[PDB]
Design a protein around this ligand. Structure first.
Ligand SMILES: O=c1ccn([C@@H]2O[C@H](CO)[C@@H](O)[C@H]2OP(=O)(O)O)c(=O)[nH]1
Length: 124
């Protein structure tokens, strides 16, 4: 089965592009990565850095998670990311998203052994 680590890679990693996400990027990606299967995932972020660089965040700045848990980490350096937010008129199964590129510090929750990212908490 798909591990939590694998799920994080499927939902949040897109190293390929150095970040040139077209206005259509999210519509394509959210569907291709199976994030609009049962419903339109409201918010989802894709990170364009290498897997190694993102995994390394689990050893960076320990910060509180939005849910109160203590296992979140903020990247010291900013990272190339693309935020996908469902449009107000999005109608499942026809999920529509607004694509927004940015360079911010990411905050991810890490778990397991190896200690790797399993949830994308926020970008700041
Ligand atoms: O900036 C943000 C904030 C949230 N999320 C994803 O949306 C879920 C609900 O907030 C968050 O749980 C998280 O999905 P998860 O990683 O848990 O699958 C983002 O992707 N980026």
């Amino acid at each position: 089965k798909e591990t939590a680590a694998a799920k994080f890679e499927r939902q949040h990693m897109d190293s390929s592009t150095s970040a040139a996400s077209s206005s259509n990027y999210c519509n394509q990606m959210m569907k291709s990565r199976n994030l609009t299967k049962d419903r339109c995932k409201p918010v989802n972020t894709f990170v364009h850095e290498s897997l190694a660089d993102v995994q390394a965040v689990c050893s960076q700045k320990n910060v509180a998670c939005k849910n109160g848990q203590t296992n979140c980490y903020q990247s010291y350096s900013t990272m190339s990311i693309t935020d996908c937010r469902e449009t107000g008129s999005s109608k499942y199964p026809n999920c529509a998203y607004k694509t927004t590129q940015a360079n911010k510090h990411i905050i991810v929750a890490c778990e397991g052994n190896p200690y790797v990212p399993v949830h994308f908490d926020a970008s700041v």
